[PDB]
Design a binder for this molecule. Structure first.
Ligand SMILES: Nc1ncnc2c1ncn2[C@@H]1O[C@H](COP(=O)(O)OP(=O)(O)OP(=O)(O)O)[C@@H](O)[C@H]1O
Ligand SMILES: [Mg+2]
Lengths: 189, 384, 328, 17, 283, 166
C-alpha cells in the first residue's frame, strides 16, 4: 500500500498470494540485504497482473516473511519461532534433550521460503552459545544440531497417512468398526 | 516568523495561492498553461491569461489528480512564485499539497523541482484529509475538537471518501466514486441541448457552468417536484440572459427541469454512468464499517465536507437522512436477532457544513503554517 | 536449418529414439513435449511438478523414460503408462541446487551433479518403489558443472569450478556386475578417485567433458578459452590447445579423431586430434550478426546414432532457436 | 501539534416523508 | 516573462474590486490581508479599527530611517497628496482611502497605490540626479541596506553618476552560473553605443570601496552601473528609476530559470536513453 | 584520433567479460544473488581490469560468473563542467528503477557505475549492451558540451534586453 498500489482486503486476497508465493525469501544476514537494497537495484522485480498492469516489488520481499522471527512487527506478543523452539526443547527431562536436538522436522506450506532452513540453524546455535554454554567456544563441535527438511515438506501429513494405512491395511483392530457405534457409541482406541 | 509562509494548492481545475495567516486565498486561477508551438522558453502565460489566446496552444498539466508533464509544472510554479505572489523562494517556507494515494516517486520529483531549482529553505507536503478536518472547528462548539472523522473530498476530478482516526489516515479504507463536477456539467449540457434553441455551440460549456453555479439544488423526492413545476410554473421557473461572443446579440433561456436533476447524479450515478450504480449514501457506510471496531461511533458523529461540488443547497441533509435510515434498519435487525430483552443505543449521525467549504484545504494549510512550532517539522535544505 | 520455437531461451533439450519427439524447458518451472505432425512442430504435452527453475533433462530411449532435475533440490522420473505422463519420486539428500543430470548406457543408474560439492548416483528399488542415492564427495571442493559416462557403465567423468577435471568410479554392487580391466586403472571400489587433471597454472572453470567411442580418451573445455584431450592407452598424457576465441560451453566426440565444440561465439567448430598427441584447429561450420544463432549456444547433441556413426548434430541456445547441422 | 492549531484558531416540513 | 513588473498585483486587484463595488452601490465588506514582496518588505491592507467604509494600506520597511534621512517624506507628500495619514502601530508609511468621496477616474489612484515601494525609493535617486542638473558637486556618497548582508552605494561626479550593488549567493552552483551570466554585462556596453556602462570585479571591492570597509569573500560580488546625464535628464528619469530599482531580483530570477531550463534537457536525454535501451529486447 | 582507440579497447575488454552463466548460491540454500556484490567465494571472481587514456579518465571492469560491474569516470575541464557533470549523474541515479542496468551509488573515485546480471543478458542481446555503453561514454560529453554553450548563449539576450530600454 505504501508504493501507490491499492489492493482491497477481500477481492484481491488471492492476487497478492501469488506474489508472496513467487517472490519472497528470508534473509540470512540482514546487513547485506539492506546494503543490496540501498546501493543496488537487483532486488526489484516486475509482476504482471490479470488486468494487464505491471507492478514493481523491491525491498518488500524480505520484510514480509520476517514476522516469523520478529513477531512484534504486526502486533503479536511473543518470542518468535527460533526462540520458541529453544524454550520448547529446554523444557523436557535432561536425558531426552539430545534426542530432540538431532531430529527436528519442518512441515507445512508456510516453511518453503528460501533460506528458512538456513536461518534457524544459525539462530539456535547463537541462542545455545550465549544462554546455556556461555562462552568457551570449543565444545560446540561436540554439540551436534541438525534440521531435516526434504523438498517434499507440503504433503508430509499426507505421505505419513499413505504409509500407516498401507502397513495396517489388513488387521481389523486399527479401524473403528461400523458395528461398534451400533451398540456402544464411543471408542477407546 | 519574520516573513509568513507560502501556501499553494494545485488541482485538476483550479489552483489556489496565498500567504500564511490569511483567511481567504489571494488568487484562485485555472490550472492552464499556454505556450507557442534562446529565451523562447519563458514566452508563456498561466491562468486567466491562457483560457483564450489566438496564437498559443493551451493545455492542462494536471489530470485526474496526478501530474502528466513536469516540464509544464516547473514553469507554472516559476510564474506562480515570481509574478503573482512576488516572493523570493530563498527566504520563505512552502506548504504544498499532495493527492490521496500518492506514490513516493511523484512526491520526490516535487522536492527535486523545489530544492534544486528554487533553493527553498523548507518544504512540507501535507495530506488533504487532516487539513480539511482542521478547518471544521471554525463553526463547531467548544466542547468538541478532535482529529477523528470521515472526509468526503469532492471537486472536479474523482470523489474520495477518506477516514482519519486520531490524526492519521487509514490508507486501506479509501474508496473512489468516479462522479464529480465535470460529469455534472457534461450531463446538464446534454439536458440543455434537447429542449432549448438559442445557445451557440461555442459557449455551451460556459452557459452550462453558469446554470450549475447560479440555480441548482437537491430535492427530497423527484415526482413531487416534477408535479410542482407543471402545477405552478411562475414560482419555480426562471430566466437566464447571456451575451453572445459575436455581435453582442443578447439571448435568453428558461431554466426548468435541469435545476434539480444536476446534483442528483451523486445519489443516482446510473443516470449518467452505466458502469457504476452504488449511491454515495452506501459508500460512506461501507467505508466506515470496514475499520477498527473501537472507532466506529466517532466517525459517524463527524462527517465533514470539503470541496466545491458539495456546495449545493441541502446536500448534507440527504446524506444525513439516508445514513440514519440505513443504520436504523441494521440496529433493528440486530435487536430482533436477540429477542427484545435489550435495546442498543441509537447511533447519532451528523454532517457538518461551514462557511469555509470551497477552499478548506488552503485554510487548514494557512492555520497550520502560522504556528511557531511549524518550523520544526519541515525538511531543511541540508537534509536533501 | 534453423527453427525458432519461442523467443525465450531454451535451458536444455532432449531427443528420443526415433527423433520424432523433443522435450524442452523454456526458462521456467515446466517441461514441454513437442511432436512432428508432418512438416510442422506442434506442442503435445506439458509436465509441471517443479516449484523452481528447471536445469536438466534427459531421455532414456530403450526404456523411454524422462529424468528431470532443477534448482528446487528435487528430481523426478517421468514415465508413460497411460496417455498421461506420471512422475516417480527420487530421494537425493542434497541441500543446495542441482545442476546436471544424465542417464547411463545400460539405463539402470543415473548421475546428478549438484552445488553441494557432491555427485549423486541414483538407482532403483522396488520394495517400496522409489530411487535411492549414493554420494561421491571426497576430493571435490566446489560445484560440479558437467558429467559424462564411460561405455562400460562404471567410470564417470566430472568437471567442477575448482579448476579440475576428475575421473571417478561409480561401481554399485547391488545392481552392476563385475567389470573388466581398463587402461585407466585396475582397482575400482565405489567413490575411488581414478585420475585427476587440471594442472596448467591459469586454469579456468571447466564447462564440458566427454568420452570417446573407444572409451580410452577424454576431452574437456575450460573458461580460459582452451580445449584439452587426455589419452590413457599409451600413457596417462595430456595435450592442451589454446584457442583465440571466446569460451566454449559444450563438447562432444564425433569420432576417435575429431571433436566438435560450441560456445558464446554462436558458431560450432571442429578440432582434430592426431594419434601422436597433437591438437590442431580445422575450421568453423557456419561459413545483426553473420551467424544463424543470435546468442550463445548452450547445448550440443547428436541427431544420428551417436559416436559409432555420427552424421548430423543439433545445437540449441539462449536465442530460442534450434538448429540441425549436417557435415555432408 | 494540535495544541498550536487550536490555540491559533481564535487568534487569527417536507423532509420526513 | 523577461522583465519583472514594478507593480504589486494584490493591491491593485483588491482596491479595484472594492472601488468598483463601492461605485456600484452595494455595501462594502471587511478585508484583513497581510502580504510580502521582494527585499523583505511586508504590507498590510485593513479597515481602520472597526469602520468598514475606509481602507488603509500600510508598508513595513525595516530600513526606512536612512531613506527618511535622505528625504523620502517630501516625495510622498508631493505624489499621493492628502491620502497620507498618521502611521499605524508598527508600520512606517500608511495610505488611507475613503469609499464615499472617490474620484470619477479610478485608474490613476489604483495605479499609484501599487508603486509604494518605487515612490519610497525614488527620493535618493531624485536627489542625487538633481546634482548634475544644478552642478553642486563635492558631496559624500550614500549607503542603503536592502537586507542583513547587502548594500547599495550611490555617488555623483561632475560628468557621471554611479550606483554600486553588492550581491551574495548561497549555493555553489549559483556562483559559477552568476559568473557566466554577469560577465556578459561588461561587454554589453561595447555591443551598443547609447547605453549605460557596467563594471565588475570579483571577490574584492573596487578602488572607491576599498577605501571604506566593505565585505571580502568568495560569495560577494560588486556590480557598478555608470549613468550619463543623457539618461538621467528630466524627461527620462522615471524609466531609469523604474529599472535600476530591480536588478538583484532580475539576476536571481534568471539564475533560477537557467537551472530549470537545464532540467528539461536532462529529462529529454533520460527519455532518449530509455528508448534506445528498450530497442535491444527481442520483444 | 585518440578517442577511437580508447572506445575500441573498452569494446574489446567488454566483449571478453560479458560471457555469463546462471549460478545458485553455495552458502545459503536457493538464493540467486550476484557474485560481485555479495563476495562469498574467491574461486568465482575474476581479476579486475583497468583501462585509461590520461590521468583523469579511466574505466574499471570487475568480472564474475554471473555479474559484471563497470565503473566509468568522465572528463572535467573547469568548474561549470564539474557541477553540470555532477548534476547529470545525480539526475540519472535517481531514476534507477527504469534504467535496469544502473547502480544507485557509484564506486568511490568514479562517477557512474553499471551492474549487468545474466538476467539482463538473456532478456536482451549481447552486442547491443556493449554498444549502449559505448554510446553512453560519448553522448554525455556531447550533451554537457552543448549545455555549456546553451547557458552561455542565454546571457547575451538577457543582457541586451535589459540594456536596451535605458
Ligand atoms: N456553487 C459552486 N461554487 C463554486 N464552485 C462550484 C459550485 N458548484 C459547483 N462548483 C464546481 O466546483 C469546482 C471547484 O473546483 P475545486 O477547487 O473544488 O477543485 P480542485 O480541488 O481543483 O479539484 P480536484 O480535487 O479534483 O483536484 C468547479 O468545477 C466548479 O464548477
Ligand atoms: Mg480540493
Amino acid at each position: 500500500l505504501l508504493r501507490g498500489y491499492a489492493f482491497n482486503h477481500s477481492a484481491d486476497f488471492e492476487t497478492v498470494r501469488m506474489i508472496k508465493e513467487k517472490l519472497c525469501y528470508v534473509g540470512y544476514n540482514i546487513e547485506q540485504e539492506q546494503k543490496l537494497a540501498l546501493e543496488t537495484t537487483v532486488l526489484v522485480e516486475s509482476y504482471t497482473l490479470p488486468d494487464g498492469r505491471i507492478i514493481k516489488v523491491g525491498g518488500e520481499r524480505f520484510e514480509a516473511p520476517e514476522a516469523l522471527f520478529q513477531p512484534h512487527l504486526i502486533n503479536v506478543e511473543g518470542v518468535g519461532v527460533a526462540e520458541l523452539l529453544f524454550n520448547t526443547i529446554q523444557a523436557a527431562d535432561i536425558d531426552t534433550r539430545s534426542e530432540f536436538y538431532k531430529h527436528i522436522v519442518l512441515s507445512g506450506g508456510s516453511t518453503m521460503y528460501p533460506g528458512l532452513p538456513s536461518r534457524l540453524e544459525r539462530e539456535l546455535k547463537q541462542l545455545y552459545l550465549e544462554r546455556v554454554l556461555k562462552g568457551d567456544v570449543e565444545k560446540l563441535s561436540k554439540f551436534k544440531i541438525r534440521i531435516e527438511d526434504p523438498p517434499r515438506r507440503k504433503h508430509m501429513v499426507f505421505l505419513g497417512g499413505a504409509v500407516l494405512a498401507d502397513i495396517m491395511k489388513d488387521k481389523d483392530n486399527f479401524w473403528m468398526t461400523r458395528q461398534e457405534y451400533q451398540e456402544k457409541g464411543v471408542r477407546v482406541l | 516568523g519574520r516573513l509568513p509562509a507560502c501556501v499553494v494548492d494545485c488541482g485538476t481545475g483550479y489552483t489556489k495561492l496565498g500567504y500564511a495567516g490569511n483567511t481567504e486565498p489571494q488568487f484562485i486561477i485555472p490550472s492552464c498553461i499556454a505556450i507557442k508551438e534562446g529565451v523562447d522558453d519563458l514566452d508563456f502565460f498561466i491562468g486567466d491569461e491562457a483560457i483564450e489566446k489566438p496564437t498559443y496552444a493551451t493545455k492542462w498539466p494536471i489530470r485526474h489528480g496526478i501530474v502528466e508533464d513536469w516540464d509544464l509544472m516547473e514553469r507554472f510554479m516559476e510564474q506562480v512564485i515570481f509574478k503573482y505572489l512576488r516572493a523570493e523562494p530563498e527566504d520563505h517556507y512552502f506548504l504544498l499539497t499532495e493527492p490521496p494515494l500518492n506514490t513516493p516517486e511523484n512526491r520526490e520529483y516535487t522536492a527535486e523541482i523545489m530544492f534544486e531549482s528554487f533553493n527553498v529553505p523548507g518544504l512540507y507536503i501535507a495530506v488533504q484529509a487532516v487539513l480539511a478536518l482542521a478547518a471544521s472547528w471554525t463553526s463547531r462548539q467548544v466542547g468538541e475538537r478532535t482529529l477523528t472523522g470521515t472526509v468526503i473530498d469532492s471537486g472536479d476530478g474523482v470523489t474520495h471518501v477518506i477516514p482519519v482516526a486520531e490524526g492519521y489516515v487509514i490508507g486501506s479504507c479509501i474508496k473512489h466514486i468516479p462522479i464529480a463536477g465535470r460529469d455534472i456539467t457534461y450531463f446538464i449540457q446534454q439536458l440543455l441541448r434537447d429542449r432549448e434553441v438559442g445557445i451557440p455551440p461555442e459557449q455551451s460549456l460556459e452557459t452550462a457552468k453558469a446554470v450549475k453555479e447560479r440555480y441548482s439544488y437537491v430535492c427530497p423526492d423527484l415526482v413531487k417536484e416534477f408535479n410542482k413545476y407543471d402545477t405552478d410554473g411562475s414560482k419555480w421557473i426562471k430566466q437566464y440572459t447571456g451575451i453572445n461572443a459575436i455581435s453582442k446579440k443578447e439571448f435568453s433561456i428558461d431554466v426548468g427541469y435541469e435545476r434539480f436533476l444536476g446534483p442528483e447524479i451523486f445519489f443516482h450515478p446510473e443516470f449518467a454512468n452505466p458502469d457504476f450504480t452504488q449511491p454515495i449514501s452506501e459508500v460512506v457506510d461501507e467505508v466506515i464499517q470496514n475499520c477498527p471496531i473501537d472507532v466506529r461511533r466517532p466517525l459517524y458523529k463527524n462527517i465533514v465536507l470539503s470541496g466545491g461540488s458539495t456546495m449545493f443547497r441541502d446536500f448534507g441533509r440527504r446524506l444525513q437522512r439516508d445514513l440514519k435510515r440505513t443504520v436504523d434498519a441494521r440496529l433493528k435487525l440486530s435487536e430482533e436477532l436477540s429477542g427484545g430483552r435489550l435495546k442498543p443505543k441509537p447511533i447519532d449521525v451528523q454532517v457538518i457544513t461551514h462557511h469555509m467549504q470551497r477552499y478548506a484545504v488552503w485554510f487548514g494549510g494557512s492555520m497550520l503554517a502560522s504556528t511557531p512550532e511549524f518550523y520544526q517539522v519541515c525538511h531543511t535544505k541540508k537534509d536533501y | 536449418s534453423l527453427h525458432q520455437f519461442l523467443l525465450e531461451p531454451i535451458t536444455c533439450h532432449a531427443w528420443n529414439r526415433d527423433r520424432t519427439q523433443i522435450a524442452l524447458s523454456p526458462n521456467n518451472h515446466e517441461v514441454h513435449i513437442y511432436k512432428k505432425n508432418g512438416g510442422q512442430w506442434v506442442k503435445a504435452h506439458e509436465l509441471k511438478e517443479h516449484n523452481g527453475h528447471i536445469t536438466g533433462i534427459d531421455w532414456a530411449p530403450k526404456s523411454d523414460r524422462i529424468v528431470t532435475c532443477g534448482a528446487d533440490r528435487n528430481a523426478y522420473v517421468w514415465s508413460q503408462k497411460d496417455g498421461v505422463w506420471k512422475p516417480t519420486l527420487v530421494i537425493l539428500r542434497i541441500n543446495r541446487a542441482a545442476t546436471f543430470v544424465k542417464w547411463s548406457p545400460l539405463e539402470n543408474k543415473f548421475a546428478v551433479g549438484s552445488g553441494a560439492r557432491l555427485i549423486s548416483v541414483c538407482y532403483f528399488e522396488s520394495e517400496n518403489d522409489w530411487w535411492v542415492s549414493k554420494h561421491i564427495k571426497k576430493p571435490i571442493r566446489s560445484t560440479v558443472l558437467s558429467l559424462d559416462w564411460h561405455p562400460n557403465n562404471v567410470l564417470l567423468a566430472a568437471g567442477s569450478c575448482d579448476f579440475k577435471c576428475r575421473v571417478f568410479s561409480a561401481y554399485i554392487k547391488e545392481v552392476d556386475e563385475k567389470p573388466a580391466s581398463t587402461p585407466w586403472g585396475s582397482k575400482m571400489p565405489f567413490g575411488q578417485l581414478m585420475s585427476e587433471f587440471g594442472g596448467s597454472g591459469t586454469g579456468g572453470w571447466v564447462h564440458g567433458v566427454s568420452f570417446s567411442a573407444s572409451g580410452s580418451r577424454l576431452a574437456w573445455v575450460s573458461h580460459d578459452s582452451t580445449v584439452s584431450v587426455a589419452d590413457a592407452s599409451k600413457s596417462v598424457q595430456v595435450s592442451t590447445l589454446k584457442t583465440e576465441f571466446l569460451p566454449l560451453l559444450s563438447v562432444s566426440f564425433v569420432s576417435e579423431n575429431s571433436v566438435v565444440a560450441a560456445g558464446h561465439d554462436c558458431c560450432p567448430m571442429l578440432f582434430n586430434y592426431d594419434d601422436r598427441g597433437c591438437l590442431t584447429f580445422v575450421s568453423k561450420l557456419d561459413i545483426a550478426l553473420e551467424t544463424l544463432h543470435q546468442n550463445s549456444i548452450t547445448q550440443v547433441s547428436i541427431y544420428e546414432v551417436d559416436k559409432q556413426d555420427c552424421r548430423k548434430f543439433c545445437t540449441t541456445g539462449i536465442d530460442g532457436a534450434m538448429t540441425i547441422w549436417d557435415f555432408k | 501539534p494540535t495544541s498550536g492549531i487550536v490555540g491559533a484558531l481564535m487568534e487569527v416540513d417536507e423532509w420526513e416523508d | 516573462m523577461i522583465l519583472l513588473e514594478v507593480n504589486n498585483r494584490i493591491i491593485e486587484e483588491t482596491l479595484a474590486l472594492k472601488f468598483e463595488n463601492a461605485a456600484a452601490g452595494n455595501k462594502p465588506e471587511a478585508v484583513e490581508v497581510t502580504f510580502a514582496d521582494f527585499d523583505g518588505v511586508l504590507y498590510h491592507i485593513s479597515n481602520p479599527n472597526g469602520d468598514k467604509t475606509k481602507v488603509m494600506v500600510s508598508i513595513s520597511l525595516k530600513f526606512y530611517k536612512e531613506l527618511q534621512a535622505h528625504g523620502a517624506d517630501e516625495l510622498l507628500k508631493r505624489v499621493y497628496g492628502s491620502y497620507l495619514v498618521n502611521p499605524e502601530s508598527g508600520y512606517n508609511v500608511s495610505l488611507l482611502y475613503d469609499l464615499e468621496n472617490l474620484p470619477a477616474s479610478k485608474d490613476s489612484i489604483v495605479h499609484q497605490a501599487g508603486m509604494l515601494k518605487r515612490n519610497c525609493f525614488a527620493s535618493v535617486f531624485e536627489k542625487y540626479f538633481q546634482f548634475q542638473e544644478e552642478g553642486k558637486e563635492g558631496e559624500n556618497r550614500a549607503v542603503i541596506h536592502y537586507r542583513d548582508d547587502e548594500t547599495m552605494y550611490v555617488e555623483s561626479k561632475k560628468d557621471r553618476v554611479t550606483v554600486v550593488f553588492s550581491t551574495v549567493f548561497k549555493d555553489d552552483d549559483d556562483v559559477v552560473i552568476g559568473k557566466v551570466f554577469m560577465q556578459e554585462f561588461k561587454e554589453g556596453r561595447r555591443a551598443s553605443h547609447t547605453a549605460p556602462q557596467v563594471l565588475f570585479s570579483h571577490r574584492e571591492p573596487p578602488l572607491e570601496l576599498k577605501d571604506t570597509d566593505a565585505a571580502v569573500g568568495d560569495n560577494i560580488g560588486y556590480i557598478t552601473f555608470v549613468l550619463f546625464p543623457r539618461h538621467t535628464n528630466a524627461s527620462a528619469r522615471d524609466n531609469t528609476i523604474n529599472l535600476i530599482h530591480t536588478f538583484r531580483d532580475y539576476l536571481h530570477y534568471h539564475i533560477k530559470c537557467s537551472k530549470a531550463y537545464i532540467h528539461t534537457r536532462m529529462r529529454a536525454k533520460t527519455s532518449d536513453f530509455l528508448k534506445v535501451l528498450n530497442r535491444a529486447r527481442p520483444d | 584520433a585518440t578517442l577511437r582507440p580508447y572506445l575500441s579497447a573498452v569494446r574489446a575488454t567488454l566483449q571478453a567479460a560479458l560471457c555469463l552463466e546462471n549460478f545458485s548460491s553455495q552458502v545459503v540454500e536457493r538464493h540467486n544473488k550476484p557474485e560481485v556484490e555479495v563476495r562469498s567465494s574467491k574461486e568465482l571472481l575474476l581479476q579486475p581490469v583497468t583501462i585509461s587514456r590520461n590521468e583523469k579518465e579511466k574505466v574499471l571492469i570487475e568480472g564474475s560468473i554471473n555479474s559484471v560491474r563497470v565503473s566509468i569516470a568522465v572528463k572535467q575541464a573547469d568548474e561549470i563542467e564539474k557541477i553540470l557533470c555532477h548534476k547529470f549523474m545525480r539526475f540519472m541515479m535517481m531514476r534507477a528503477e527504469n534504467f535496469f542496468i544502473l547502480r544507485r551509488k557509484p564506486v568511490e573515485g568514479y562517477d557512474i557505475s553499471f551492474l549487468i546480471t545474466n538476467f539482463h543478458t538473456e532478456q536482451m542481446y549481447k552486442h547491443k549492451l556493449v554498444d549502449f555503453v559505448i554510446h553512453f561514454m560519448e553522448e554525455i560529453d556531447k550533451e554537457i558540451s552543448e549545455m555549456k554553450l546553451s547557458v552561455n548563449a542565454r546571457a547575451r539576450i538577457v543582457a541586451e534586453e535589459f540594456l536596451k530600454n535605458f
